[PDB]
PDB file of C-alpha atoms in Angstrom:
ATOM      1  CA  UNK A   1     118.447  83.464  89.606  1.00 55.18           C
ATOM      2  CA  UNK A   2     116.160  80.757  90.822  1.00 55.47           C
ATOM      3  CA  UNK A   3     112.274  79.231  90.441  1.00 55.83           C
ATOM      4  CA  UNK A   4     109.738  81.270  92.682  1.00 57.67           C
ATOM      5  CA  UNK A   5     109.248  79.380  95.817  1.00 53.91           C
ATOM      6  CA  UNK A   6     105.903  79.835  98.054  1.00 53.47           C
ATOM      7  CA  UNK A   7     107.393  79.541 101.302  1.00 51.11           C
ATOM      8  CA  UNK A   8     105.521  78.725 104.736  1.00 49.01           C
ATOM      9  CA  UNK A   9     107.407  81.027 107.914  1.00 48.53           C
ATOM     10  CA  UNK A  10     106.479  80.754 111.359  1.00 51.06           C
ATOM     11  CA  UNK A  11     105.550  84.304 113.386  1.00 46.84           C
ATOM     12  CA  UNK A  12     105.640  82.908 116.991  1.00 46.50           C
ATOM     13  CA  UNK A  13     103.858  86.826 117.074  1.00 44.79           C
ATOM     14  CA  UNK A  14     100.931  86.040 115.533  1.00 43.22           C
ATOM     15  CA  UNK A  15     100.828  82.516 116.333  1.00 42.78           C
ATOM     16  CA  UNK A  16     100.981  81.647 112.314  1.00 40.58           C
ATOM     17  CA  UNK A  17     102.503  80.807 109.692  1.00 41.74           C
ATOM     18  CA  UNK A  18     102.953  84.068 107.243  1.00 39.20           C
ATOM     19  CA  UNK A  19     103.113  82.397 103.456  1.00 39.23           C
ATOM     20  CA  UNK A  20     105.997  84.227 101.386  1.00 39.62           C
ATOM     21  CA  UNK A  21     106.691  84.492  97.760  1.00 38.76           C
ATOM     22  CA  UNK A  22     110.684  83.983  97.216  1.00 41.30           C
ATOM     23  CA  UNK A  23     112.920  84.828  94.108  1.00 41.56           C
ATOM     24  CA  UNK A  24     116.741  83.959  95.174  1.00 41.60           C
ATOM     25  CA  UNK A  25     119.454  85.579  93.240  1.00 41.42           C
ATOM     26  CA  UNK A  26     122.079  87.535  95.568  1.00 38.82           C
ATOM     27  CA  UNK A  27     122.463  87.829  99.695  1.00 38.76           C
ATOM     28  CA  UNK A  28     120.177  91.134  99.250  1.00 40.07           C
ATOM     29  CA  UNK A  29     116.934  91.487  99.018  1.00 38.12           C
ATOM     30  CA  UNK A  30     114.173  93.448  97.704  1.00 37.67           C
ATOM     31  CA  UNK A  31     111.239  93.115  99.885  1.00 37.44           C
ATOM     32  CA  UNK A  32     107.957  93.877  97.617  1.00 38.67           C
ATOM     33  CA  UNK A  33     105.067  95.028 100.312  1.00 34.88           C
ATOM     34  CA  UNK A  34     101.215  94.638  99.399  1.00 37.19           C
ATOM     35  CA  UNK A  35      98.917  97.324  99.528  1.00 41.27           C
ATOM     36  CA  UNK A  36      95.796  97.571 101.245  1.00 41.15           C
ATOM     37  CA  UNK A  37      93.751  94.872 100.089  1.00 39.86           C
ATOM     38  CA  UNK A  38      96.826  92.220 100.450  1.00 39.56           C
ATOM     39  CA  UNK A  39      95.105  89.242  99.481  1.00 41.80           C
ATOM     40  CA  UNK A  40      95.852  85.777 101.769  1.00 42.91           C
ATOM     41  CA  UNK A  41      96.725  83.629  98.205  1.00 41.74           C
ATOM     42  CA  UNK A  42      99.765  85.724  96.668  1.00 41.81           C
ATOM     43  CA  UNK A  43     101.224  88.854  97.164  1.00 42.90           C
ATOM     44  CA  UNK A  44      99.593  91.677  95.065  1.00 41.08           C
ATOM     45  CA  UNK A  45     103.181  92.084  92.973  1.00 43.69           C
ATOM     46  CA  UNK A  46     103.011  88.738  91.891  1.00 43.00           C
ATOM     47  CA  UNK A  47      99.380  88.817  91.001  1.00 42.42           C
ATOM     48  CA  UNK A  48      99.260  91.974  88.947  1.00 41.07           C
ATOM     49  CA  UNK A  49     103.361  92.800  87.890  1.00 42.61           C
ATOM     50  CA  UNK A  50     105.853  90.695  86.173  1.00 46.50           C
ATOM     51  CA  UNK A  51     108.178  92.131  89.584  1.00 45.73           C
ATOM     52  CA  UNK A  52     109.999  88.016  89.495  1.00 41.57           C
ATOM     53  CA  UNK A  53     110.903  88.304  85.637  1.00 38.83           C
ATOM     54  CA  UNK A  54     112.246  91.885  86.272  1.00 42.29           C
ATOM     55  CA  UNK A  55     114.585  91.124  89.267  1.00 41.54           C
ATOM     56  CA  UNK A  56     115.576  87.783  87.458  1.00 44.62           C
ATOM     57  CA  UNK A  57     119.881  88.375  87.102  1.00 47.02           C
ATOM     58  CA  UNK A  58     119.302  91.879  89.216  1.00 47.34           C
ATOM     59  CA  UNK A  59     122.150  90.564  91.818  1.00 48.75           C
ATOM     60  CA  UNK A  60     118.794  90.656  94.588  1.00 50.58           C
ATOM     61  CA  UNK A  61     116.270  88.201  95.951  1.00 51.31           C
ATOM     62  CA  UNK A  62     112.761  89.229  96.097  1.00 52.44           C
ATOM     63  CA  UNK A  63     111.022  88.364  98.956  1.00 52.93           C
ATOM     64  CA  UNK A  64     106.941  88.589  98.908  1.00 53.90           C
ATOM     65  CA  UNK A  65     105.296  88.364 101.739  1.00 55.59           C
ATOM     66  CA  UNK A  66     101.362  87.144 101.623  1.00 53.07           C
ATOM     67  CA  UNK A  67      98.547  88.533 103.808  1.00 51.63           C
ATOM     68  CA  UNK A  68      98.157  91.149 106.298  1.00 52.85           C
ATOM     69  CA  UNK A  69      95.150  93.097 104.581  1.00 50.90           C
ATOM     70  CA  UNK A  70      94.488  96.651 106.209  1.00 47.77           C
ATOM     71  CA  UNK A  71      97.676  95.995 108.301  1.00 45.00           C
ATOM     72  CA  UNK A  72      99.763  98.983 107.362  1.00 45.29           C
ATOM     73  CA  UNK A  73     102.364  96.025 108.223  1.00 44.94           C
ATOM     74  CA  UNK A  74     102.604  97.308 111.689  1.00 45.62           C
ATOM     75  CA  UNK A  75     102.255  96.195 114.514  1.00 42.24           C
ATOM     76  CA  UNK A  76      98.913  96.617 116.034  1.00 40.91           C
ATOM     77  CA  UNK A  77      97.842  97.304 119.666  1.00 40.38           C
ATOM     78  CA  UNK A  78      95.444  94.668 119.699  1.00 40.96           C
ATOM     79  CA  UNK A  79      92.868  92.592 117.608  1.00 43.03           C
ATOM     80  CA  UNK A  80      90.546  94.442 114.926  1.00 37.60           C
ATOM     81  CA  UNK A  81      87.287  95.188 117.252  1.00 37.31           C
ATOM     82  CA  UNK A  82      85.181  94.869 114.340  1.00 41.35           C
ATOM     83  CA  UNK A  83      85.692  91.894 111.980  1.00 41.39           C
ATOM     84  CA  UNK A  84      86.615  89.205 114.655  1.00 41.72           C
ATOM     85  CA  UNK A  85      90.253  88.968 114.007  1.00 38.43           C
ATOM     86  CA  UNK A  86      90.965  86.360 116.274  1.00 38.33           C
ATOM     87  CA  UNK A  87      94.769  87.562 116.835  1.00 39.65           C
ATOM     88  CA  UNK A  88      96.773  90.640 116.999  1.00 40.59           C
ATOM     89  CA  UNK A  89      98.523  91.585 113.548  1.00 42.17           C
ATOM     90  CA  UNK A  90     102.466  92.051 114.711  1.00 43.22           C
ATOM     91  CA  UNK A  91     103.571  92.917 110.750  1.00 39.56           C
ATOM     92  CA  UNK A  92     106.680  94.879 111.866  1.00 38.36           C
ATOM     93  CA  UNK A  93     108.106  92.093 114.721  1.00 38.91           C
ATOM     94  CA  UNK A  94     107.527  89.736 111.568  1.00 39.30           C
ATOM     95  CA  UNK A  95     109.572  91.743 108.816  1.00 43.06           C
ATOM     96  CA  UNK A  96     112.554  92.912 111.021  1.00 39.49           C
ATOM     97  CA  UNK A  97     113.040  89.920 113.373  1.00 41.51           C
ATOM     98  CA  UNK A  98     110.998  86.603 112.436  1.00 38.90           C
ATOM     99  CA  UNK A  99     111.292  86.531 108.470  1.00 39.24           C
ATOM    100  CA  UNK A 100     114.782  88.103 108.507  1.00 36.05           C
ATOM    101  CA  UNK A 101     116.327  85.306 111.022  1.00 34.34           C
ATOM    102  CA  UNK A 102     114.446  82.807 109.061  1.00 36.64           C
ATOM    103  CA  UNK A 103     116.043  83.501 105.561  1.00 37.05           C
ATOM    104  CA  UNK A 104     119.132  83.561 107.062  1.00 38.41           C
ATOM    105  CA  UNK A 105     119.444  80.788 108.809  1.00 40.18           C
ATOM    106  CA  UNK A 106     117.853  78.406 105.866  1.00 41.46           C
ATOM    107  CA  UNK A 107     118.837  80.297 102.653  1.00 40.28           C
ATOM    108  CA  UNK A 108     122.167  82.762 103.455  1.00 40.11           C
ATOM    109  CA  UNK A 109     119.720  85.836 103.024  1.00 38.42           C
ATOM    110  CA  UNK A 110     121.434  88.642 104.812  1.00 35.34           C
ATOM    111  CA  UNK A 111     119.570  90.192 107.184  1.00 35.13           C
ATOM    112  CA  UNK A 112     120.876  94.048 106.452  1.00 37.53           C
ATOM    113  CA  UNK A 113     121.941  95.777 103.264  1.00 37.98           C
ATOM    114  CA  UNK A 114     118.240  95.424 101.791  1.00 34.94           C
ATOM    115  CA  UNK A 115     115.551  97.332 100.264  1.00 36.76           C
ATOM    116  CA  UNK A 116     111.441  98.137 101.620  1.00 36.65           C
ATOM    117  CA  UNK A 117     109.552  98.737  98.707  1.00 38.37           C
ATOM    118  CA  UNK A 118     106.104  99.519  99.409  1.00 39.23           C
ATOM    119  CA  UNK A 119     102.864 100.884  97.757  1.00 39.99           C
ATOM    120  CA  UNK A 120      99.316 102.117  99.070  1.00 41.46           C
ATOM    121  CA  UNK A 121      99.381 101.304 102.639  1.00 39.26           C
ATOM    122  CA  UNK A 122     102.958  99.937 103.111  1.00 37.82           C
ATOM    123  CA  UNK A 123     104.232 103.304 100.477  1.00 38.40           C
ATOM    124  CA  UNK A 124     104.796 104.796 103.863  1.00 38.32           C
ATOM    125  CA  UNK A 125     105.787 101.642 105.802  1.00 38.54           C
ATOM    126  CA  UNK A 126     108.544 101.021 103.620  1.00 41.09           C
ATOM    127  CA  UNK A 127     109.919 104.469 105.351  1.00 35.21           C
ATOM    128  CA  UNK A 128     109.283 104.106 108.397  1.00 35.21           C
ATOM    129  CA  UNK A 129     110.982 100.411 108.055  1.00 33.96           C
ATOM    130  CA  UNK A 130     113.893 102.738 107.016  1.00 36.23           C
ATOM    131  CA  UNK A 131     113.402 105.000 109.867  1.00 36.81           C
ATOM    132  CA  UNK A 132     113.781 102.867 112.506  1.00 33.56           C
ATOM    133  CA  UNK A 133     115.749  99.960 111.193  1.00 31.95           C
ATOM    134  CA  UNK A 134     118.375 101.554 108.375  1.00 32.54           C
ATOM    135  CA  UNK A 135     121.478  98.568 108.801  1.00 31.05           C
ATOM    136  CA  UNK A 136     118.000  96.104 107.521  1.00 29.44           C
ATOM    137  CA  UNK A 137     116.984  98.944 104.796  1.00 26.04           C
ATOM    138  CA  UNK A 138     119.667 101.592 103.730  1.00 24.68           C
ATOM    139  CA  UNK A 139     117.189 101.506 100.438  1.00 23.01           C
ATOM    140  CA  UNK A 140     112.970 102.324 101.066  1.00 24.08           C
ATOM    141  CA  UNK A 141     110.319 103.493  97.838  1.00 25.75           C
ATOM    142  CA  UNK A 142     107.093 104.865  98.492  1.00 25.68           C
ATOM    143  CA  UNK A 143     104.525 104.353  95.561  1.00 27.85           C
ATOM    144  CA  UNK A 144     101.291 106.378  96.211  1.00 29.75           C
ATOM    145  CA  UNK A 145     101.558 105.882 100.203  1.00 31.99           C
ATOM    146  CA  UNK A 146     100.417 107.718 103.247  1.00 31.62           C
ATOM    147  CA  UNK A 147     103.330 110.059 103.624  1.00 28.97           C
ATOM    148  CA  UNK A 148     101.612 112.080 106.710  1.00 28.68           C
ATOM    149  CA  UNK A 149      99.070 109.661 108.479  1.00 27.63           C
ATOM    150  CA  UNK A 150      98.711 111.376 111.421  1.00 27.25           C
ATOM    151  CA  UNK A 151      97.712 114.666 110.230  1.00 27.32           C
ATOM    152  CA  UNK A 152      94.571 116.423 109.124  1.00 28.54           C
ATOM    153  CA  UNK A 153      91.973 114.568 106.714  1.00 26.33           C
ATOM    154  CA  UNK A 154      94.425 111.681 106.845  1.00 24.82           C
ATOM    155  CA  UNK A 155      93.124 109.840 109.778  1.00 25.14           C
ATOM    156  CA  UNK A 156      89.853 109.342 108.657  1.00 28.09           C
ATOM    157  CA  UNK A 157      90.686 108.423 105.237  1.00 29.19           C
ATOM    158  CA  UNK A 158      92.882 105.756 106.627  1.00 31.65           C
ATOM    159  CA  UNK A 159      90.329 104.629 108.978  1.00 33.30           C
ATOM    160  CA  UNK A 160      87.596 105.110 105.848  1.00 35.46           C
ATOM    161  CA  UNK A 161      90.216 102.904 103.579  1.00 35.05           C
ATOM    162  CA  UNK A 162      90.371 100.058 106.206  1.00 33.51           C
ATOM    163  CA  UNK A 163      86.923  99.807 106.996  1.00 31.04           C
ATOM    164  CA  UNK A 164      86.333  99.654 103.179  1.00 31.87           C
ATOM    165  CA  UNK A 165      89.352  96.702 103.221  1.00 30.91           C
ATOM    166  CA  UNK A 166      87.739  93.780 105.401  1.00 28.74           C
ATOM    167  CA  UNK A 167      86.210  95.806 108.130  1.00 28.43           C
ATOM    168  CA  UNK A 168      89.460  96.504 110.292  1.00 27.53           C
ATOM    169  CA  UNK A 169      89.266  99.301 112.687  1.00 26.85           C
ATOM    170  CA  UNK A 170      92.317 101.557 112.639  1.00 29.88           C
ATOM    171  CA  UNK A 171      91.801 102.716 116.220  1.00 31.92           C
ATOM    172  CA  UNK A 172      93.117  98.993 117.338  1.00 31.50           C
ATOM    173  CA  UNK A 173      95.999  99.628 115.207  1.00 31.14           C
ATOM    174  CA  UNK A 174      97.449 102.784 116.544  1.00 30.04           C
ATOM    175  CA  UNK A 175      94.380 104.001 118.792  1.00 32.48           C
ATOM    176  CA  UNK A 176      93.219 107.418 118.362  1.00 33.63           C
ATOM    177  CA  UNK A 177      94.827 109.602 116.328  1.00 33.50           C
ATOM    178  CA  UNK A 178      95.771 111.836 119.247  1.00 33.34           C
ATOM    179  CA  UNK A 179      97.877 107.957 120.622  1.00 28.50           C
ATOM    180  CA  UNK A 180     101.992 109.267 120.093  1.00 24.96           C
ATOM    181  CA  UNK A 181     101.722 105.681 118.161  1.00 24.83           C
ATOM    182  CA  UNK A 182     100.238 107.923 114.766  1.00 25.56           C
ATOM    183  CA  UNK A 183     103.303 110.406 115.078  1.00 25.47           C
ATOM    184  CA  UNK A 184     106.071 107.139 115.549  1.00 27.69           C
ATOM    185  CA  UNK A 185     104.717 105.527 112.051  1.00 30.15           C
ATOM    186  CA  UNK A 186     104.168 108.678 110.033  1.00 30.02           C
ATOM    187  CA  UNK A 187     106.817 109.363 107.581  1.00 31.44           C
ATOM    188  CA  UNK A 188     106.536 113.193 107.647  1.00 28.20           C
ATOM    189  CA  UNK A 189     107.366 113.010 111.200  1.00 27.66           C
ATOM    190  CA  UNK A 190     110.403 111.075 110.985  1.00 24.97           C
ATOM    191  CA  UNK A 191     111.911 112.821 107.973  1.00 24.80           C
ATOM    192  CA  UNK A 192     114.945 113.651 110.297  1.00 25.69           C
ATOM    193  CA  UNK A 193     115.259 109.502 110.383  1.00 23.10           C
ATOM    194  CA  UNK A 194     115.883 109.163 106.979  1.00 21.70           C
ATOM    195  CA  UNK A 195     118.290 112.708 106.637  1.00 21.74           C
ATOM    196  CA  UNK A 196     119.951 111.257 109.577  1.00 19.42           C
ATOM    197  CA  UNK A 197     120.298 107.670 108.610  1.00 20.12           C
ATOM    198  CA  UNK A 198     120.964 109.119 104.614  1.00 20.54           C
ATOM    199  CA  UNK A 199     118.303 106.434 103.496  1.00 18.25           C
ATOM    200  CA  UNK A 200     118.027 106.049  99.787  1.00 19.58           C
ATOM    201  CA  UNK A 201     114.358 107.044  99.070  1.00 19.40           C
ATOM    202  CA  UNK A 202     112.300 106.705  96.302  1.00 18.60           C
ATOM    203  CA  UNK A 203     108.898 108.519  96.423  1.00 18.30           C
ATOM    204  CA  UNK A 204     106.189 108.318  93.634  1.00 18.22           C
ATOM    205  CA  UNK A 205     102.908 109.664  93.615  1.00 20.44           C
ATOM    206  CA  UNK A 206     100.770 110.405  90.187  1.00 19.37           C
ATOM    207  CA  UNK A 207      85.473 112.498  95.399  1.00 21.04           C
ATOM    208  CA  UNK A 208      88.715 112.486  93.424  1.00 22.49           C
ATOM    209  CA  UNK A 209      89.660 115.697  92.638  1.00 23.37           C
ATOM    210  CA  UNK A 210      89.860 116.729  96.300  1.00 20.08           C
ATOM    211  CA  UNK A 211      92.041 113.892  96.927  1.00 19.53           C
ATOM    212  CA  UNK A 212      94.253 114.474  93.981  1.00 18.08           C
ATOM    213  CA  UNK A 213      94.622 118.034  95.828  1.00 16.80           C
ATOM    214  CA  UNK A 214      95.697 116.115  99.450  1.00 16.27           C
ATOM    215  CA  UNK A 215      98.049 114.067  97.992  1.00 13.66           C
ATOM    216  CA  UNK A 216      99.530 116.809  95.770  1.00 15.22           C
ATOM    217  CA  UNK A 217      99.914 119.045  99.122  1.00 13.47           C
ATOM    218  CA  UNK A 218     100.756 116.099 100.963  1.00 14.34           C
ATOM    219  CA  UNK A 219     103.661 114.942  99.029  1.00 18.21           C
ATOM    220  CA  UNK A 220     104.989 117.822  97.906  1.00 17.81           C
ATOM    221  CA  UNK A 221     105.270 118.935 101.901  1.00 18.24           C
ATOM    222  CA  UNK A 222     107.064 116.182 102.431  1.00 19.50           C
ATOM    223  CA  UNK A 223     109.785 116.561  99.358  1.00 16.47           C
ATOM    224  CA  UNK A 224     109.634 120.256 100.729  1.00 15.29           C
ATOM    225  CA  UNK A 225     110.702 118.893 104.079  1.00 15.71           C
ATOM    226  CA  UNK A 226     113.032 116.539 103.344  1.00 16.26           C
ATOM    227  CA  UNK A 227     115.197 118.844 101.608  1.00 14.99           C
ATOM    228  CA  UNK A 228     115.039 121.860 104.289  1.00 15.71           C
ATOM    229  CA  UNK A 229     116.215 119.394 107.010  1.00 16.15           C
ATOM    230  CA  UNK A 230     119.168 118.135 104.837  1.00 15.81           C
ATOM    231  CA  UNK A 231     117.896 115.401 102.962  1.00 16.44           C
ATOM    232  CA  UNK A 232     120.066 114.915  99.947  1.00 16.30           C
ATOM    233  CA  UNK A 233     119.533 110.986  99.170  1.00 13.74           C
ATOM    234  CA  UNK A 234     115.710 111.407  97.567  1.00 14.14           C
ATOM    235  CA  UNK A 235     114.254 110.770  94.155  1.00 15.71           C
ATOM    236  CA  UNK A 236     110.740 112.049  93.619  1.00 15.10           C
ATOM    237  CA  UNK A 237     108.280 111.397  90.969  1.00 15.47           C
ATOM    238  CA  UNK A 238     105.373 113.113  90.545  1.00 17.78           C
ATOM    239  CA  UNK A 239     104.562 112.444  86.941  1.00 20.85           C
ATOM    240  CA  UNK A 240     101.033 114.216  86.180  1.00 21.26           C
ATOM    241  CA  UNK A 241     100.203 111.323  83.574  1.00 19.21           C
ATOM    242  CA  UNK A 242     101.373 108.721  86.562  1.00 20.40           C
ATOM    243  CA  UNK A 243      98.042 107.231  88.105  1.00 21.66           C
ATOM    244  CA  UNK A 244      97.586 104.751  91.788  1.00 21.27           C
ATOM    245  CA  UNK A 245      98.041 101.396  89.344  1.00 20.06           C
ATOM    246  CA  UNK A 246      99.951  98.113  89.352  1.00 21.17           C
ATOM    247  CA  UNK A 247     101.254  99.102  85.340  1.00 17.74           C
ATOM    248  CA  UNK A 248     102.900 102.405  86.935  1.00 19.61           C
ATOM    249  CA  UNK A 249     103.945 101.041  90.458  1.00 20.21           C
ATOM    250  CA  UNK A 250     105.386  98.425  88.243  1.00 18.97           C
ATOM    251  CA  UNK A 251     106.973 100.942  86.187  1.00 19.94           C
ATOM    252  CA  UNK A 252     108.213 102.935  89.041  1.00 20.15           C
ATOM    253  CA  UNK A 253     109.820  99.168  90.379  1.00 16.08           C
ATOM    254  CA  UNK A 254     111.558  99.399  86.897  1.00 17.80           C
ATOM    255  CA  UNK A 255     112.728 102.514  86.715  1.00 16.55           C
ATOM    256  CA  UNK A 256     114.368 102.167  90.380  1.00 13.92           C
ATOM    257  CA  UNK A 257     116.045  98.722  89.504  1.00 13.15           C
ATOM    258  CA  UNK A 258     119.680 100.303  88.493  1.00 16.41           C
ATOM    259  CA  UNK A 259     119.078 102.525  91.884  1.00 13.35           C
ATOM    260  CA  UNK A 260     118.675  99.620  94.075  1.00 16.84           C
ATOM    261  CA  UNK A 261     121.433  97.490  92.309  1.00 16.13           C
ATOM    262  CA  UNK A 262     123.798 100.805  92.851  1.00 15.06           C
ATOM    263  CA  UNK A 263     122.971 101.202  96.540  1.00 15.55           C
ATOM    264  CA  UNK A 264     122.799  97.696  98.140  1.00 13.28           C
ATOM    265  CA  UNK A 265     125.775  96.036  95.776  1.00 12.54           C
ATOM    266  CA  UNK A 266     127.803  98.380  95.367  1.00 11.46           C
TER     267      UNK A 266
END
């Protein structure tokens, strides 16, 4: 394996340096996302999951990236217009282009073969990830994400969520949720991606009621629609004792260790 290391990477994007939590161990990688209230000190798997000790000996790095609250870890259209974010988040730009070149250049990281593991609001950006760039991630996991952003009460419950995570203002993310930029980053949508590409996904999911019933509709139209367009490389687990917590997203990161060890080595 190797000690964590707290890295400091440059994004010429957002004119900063993005701080990263780094586990060596193999030329693949497992990259662990954050979820909606990503703090700017360590990345939520670190903070709440023993994620390092688990990957220790896996054959995979773990790479953590640190910030980027509210930033579905896209890229956005412009500054938040309504906290004062003083630059444009460019989350995507960073985690396919800037971080990538960056590990490989200093520490033999490869920059394909890997695996987008995401939960909250990156659940669904570790698919799309997939979508769009599958020689980077042949392997994405979903735990409790937006699996249909664009549609229906989704929307505003993102928008709600944000607004409730450090005032950002999900219309200078993707604009309104009529912009074609809500369609391109919902995983629903792009279900003929990840049949096409044969991604490896891994989906979990576990007032309130109400929500449990969006969710339960939600995800289950998307296992329903991954396997009528082909799909045939899925695992989903909708345990009804699962919950939206670190201990089961950490148990879910468990559980899909062997999986991700199969896939990326082999």
């Amino acid at each position: 394996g190797l000690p964590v290391e707290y890295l400091q990477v440059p994004s010429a994007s957002m004119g900063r340096d993005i701080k990263v939590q780094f586990q060596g161990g193999g030329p693949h990688a497992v990259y662990l996302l954050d979820g909606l209230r990503a703090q700017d000190d360590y990345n939520g798997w670190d903070i709440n999951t023993p994620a390092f000790e688990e990957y220790y000996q896996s054959g995979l790095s773990v790479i953590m990236p640190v910030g980027g609250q509210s930033s579905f870890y896209t890229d956005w259209y412009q500054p938040s217009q309504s906290n004062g974010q003083n630059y444009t988040y460019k989350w995507e730009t960073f985690l396919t282009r800037e971080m990538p070149a960056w590990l490989q250049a200093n520490k033999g990281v490869s920059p394909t073969g890997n695996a987008a593991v995401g939960l909250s609001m990156s659940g669904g950006s570790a698919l799309i990830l997939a979508a769009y760039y599958p020689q980077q991630f042949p392997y994405a996991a979903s735990l409790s994400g937006f699996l249909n952003p664009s549609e229906s009460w989704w929307p505003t419950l993102i928008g709600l969520a944000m607004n409730d995570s450090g005032g950002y203002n999900a219309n200078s993310m993707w604009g309104p949720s009529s912009d074609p930029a809500w369609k391109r980053n919902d995983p629903m949508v792009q279900i003929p991606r990840l049949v096409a590409n044969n991604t490896r996904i891994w989906v979990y999911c576990g007032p309130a009621k109400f929500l449990e019933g969006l969710t339960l509709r939600t995800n289950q139209t998307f296992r329903d629609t991954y396997a009528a367009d082909g799909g045939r490389n899925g695992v989903f687990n909708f345990p009804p004792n699962g919950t939206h917590s670190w201990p089961y997203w950490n148990e879910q990161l468990v559980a899909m260790k062997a999986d991700i060890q199969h896939v990326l080595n082999g």
